[PDB]
Design a protein around this ligand. Structure first.
Ligand SMILES: Nc1ncnc2c1ncn2[C@@H]1O[C@H](COP(=O)(O)OP(=O)(O)O)[C@@H](O)[C@H]1O
Ligand SMILES: Nc1ncnc2c1ncn2[C@@H]1O[C@H](COP(=O)(O)OP(=O)(O)O)[C@@H](O)[C@H]1O
Ligand SMILES: O=C(CN1CCOCC1)[C@@H](O)[C@H](O)[C@H](O)CO
Ligand SMILES: O=C(CN1CCOCC1)[C@@H](O)[C@H](O)[C@H](O)CO
Ligand SMILES: [Mg+2]
Lengths: 289, 287
């Protein structure tokens, strides 16, 4: 895909993706008397809530001992509104040689609730975790399709109705709601702890192995994790090969992939505007065909 | 400031910065240099990028402002396009603000003062202020161009998508009043960056840089509306600019009209969070 096309169009052997930073917050590294730190700053009223959700997500991931993520250090209220979030600084480059290792770790992470001393038998989370700026409901639910329809898709489409009053999105959603159970093939879904935002921009590596960060975690269907990884690219094929060697694709994976990508398109419509209307409606129509 | 707050909360004497999306894309080190690649998967990505290339080319041809050099527009398998350009190591505009003010004023004076005068408002191709394509059809009269191909275009989209009664009624009243803000003044076409908000300007060790243009020949004052309305420019930017192009009479009222355009564009891009500023600005203009 992209990287091969660029090597050809620009006629280069090497191509190494690199690189205040961030889509939601302003992030900067500082050296301090006790070593380096990384600080995210967000001036919006809800910033503390956002960062507390990130802290809870980082803590949940660190507790598994299966992946490396930055240690959360402090959330600081700012005079004039908003908050700063200080965490451990990690020297990092984009994910490349460590992709297959990350695929193993992400599969082990999803499997931990099933295989480990872990007993979470509902979907959701113990606290609010933000989809970028947007707070998510993580109310525990026994049924994954219910949790995903109500607390992910319907939540996003209610915000689209409030902000864009989009007739087509409303009418397509009413039809898709009816279809959703058929996409699950009568499978028994088991809760899996998710990073929650595993875009290629949120993963990286150093000389020890891969690193992931910026989580928005909850107990969900393991497959949901991969949708954003696939739709914006940037992961080597060997990441998915390693992952699916441990967690094979269940029947209907390809159709659920559209459903989970739909959620991310809706979230990008809400965060970033009407540019994301066409893929949102287009994915709904593809699911309804 | 926030840095003193961090020193206090982390209990550290030192705090030395180091290490130096939004549906853009990514940067890549490349054999022949660093490059920056913008990706857009939508069907109209190529037209969008060709407008950005045309704008960058028009600005580069003045030699007055530093912009990234366009390299290639690539059709992407499965729709959309990538736009590859020279990579620039950049930081927030700060020390170079007054220099950029000077350069932007020279840019706006370039057309009037040069050899090959463009005598109409508009542009030779479509350019996008963000994602929405604009009409750049040449017009002799700036208030005509702006009312028709900027304000009316945005309000037609708002009527189409939102059927907003208040916007429709306020525009009915405002349209006739526009020429009052321009009477008794000479308006010369000026080449504009077209989207000069603080997030589209920066600097390095050599000087300021501007990027993501949506260019057209317009009233010079239009440039500054989005710079002012969202902040982020040092005062010295404007001081330097207005030493060369002083605020003409009626500047503050035209400023509201130009900011109105940007509020409407944001309503069309991002939805009804921008409805209140749009209608309020129209009411201010009617008071
Ligand atoms: N703990 C860290 N140490 C060093 N660099 C980091 C760290 N966390 C993030 N970064 C850098 O900051 C960028 C943005 O971080 P991210 O958590 O994705 O911010 P946002 O939520 O605002 O997008 C990352 O691509 C990475 O380059
Ligand atoms: N030529 C470049 N070299 C290096 N970084 C760039 C270049 N162009 C843009 N960037 C970075 O990408 C960010 C967004 O660029 P921009 O052209 O505004 O994209 P968009 O149209 O998606 O907003 C900038 O704020 C800057 O940090
Ligand atoms: O920002 C994120 C990823 N998108 C940024 C815009 O270019 C496409 C990838 C993630 O942190 C998340 O899915 C959400 O966008 C946060 O708002
Ligand atoms: O994105 C832009 C600037 N706005 C981003 C949201 O915070 C206020 C400034 C520009 O590219 C353009 O003026 C238009 O918004 C379409 O993108
Ligand atoms: Mg920009």
């Amino acid at each position: 895909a992209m990287e091969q096309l660029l090597r050809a169009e620009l006629r280069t052997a090497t191509l190494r993706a690199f690189g205040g930073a961030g889509c939601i917050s302003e992030g900067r590294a500082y050296d301090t008397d006790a070593g380096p730190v990384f600080v995210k700053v967000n001036r919006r009223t809800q910033a503390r809530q956002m960062f507390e959700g990130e802290v809870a997500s980082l803590e949940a991931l660190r507790s598994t001992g299966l992946v490396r993520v930055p240690r959360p250090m402090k959330v600081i209220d700012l005079p004039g509104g908003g908050a700063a979030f200080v965490m451990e600084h990690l020297k990092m480059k984009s994910l490349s040689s460590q992709a297959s290792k990350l695929g193993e770790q992400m599969a082990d992470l999803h499997l931990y609730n099933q295989k480990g001393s872990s007993y979470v038998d509902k979907f959701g989370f113990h606290t609010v975790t933000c989809c970028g700026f947007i707070p998510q409901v993580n109310e525990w639910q026994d049924d994954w399709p219910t949790f995903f329809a109500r607390h992910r898709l319907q939540a996003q489409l209610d915000l689209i109705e409030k902000d864009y009053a989009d007739r087509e999105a409303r009418e397509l959603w009413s039809r898709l709601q009816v279809k959703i159970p058929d996409l699950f093939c009568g499978l028994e879904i088991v809760p899996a702890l998710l990073h929650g935002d595993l875009w290629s921009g949120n993963v990286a590596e150093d000389d020890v192995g891969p690193i992931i960060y910026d989580p928005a975690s909850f107990y969900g269907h393991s497959e949901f994790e991969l949708a954003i990884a696939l739709m914006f690219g940037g992961f080597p094929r060997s990441f998915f090969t390693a992952y699916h060697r441990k967690i094979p694709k269940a029947p209907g994976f390809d159709q659920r992939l559209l459903l989970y990508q739909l959620f991310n398109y809706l979230n990008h419509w809400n965060h970033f505007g009407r540019e994301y209307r066409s893929p949102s409606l287009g994915t709904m129509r593809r699911l309804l065909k």
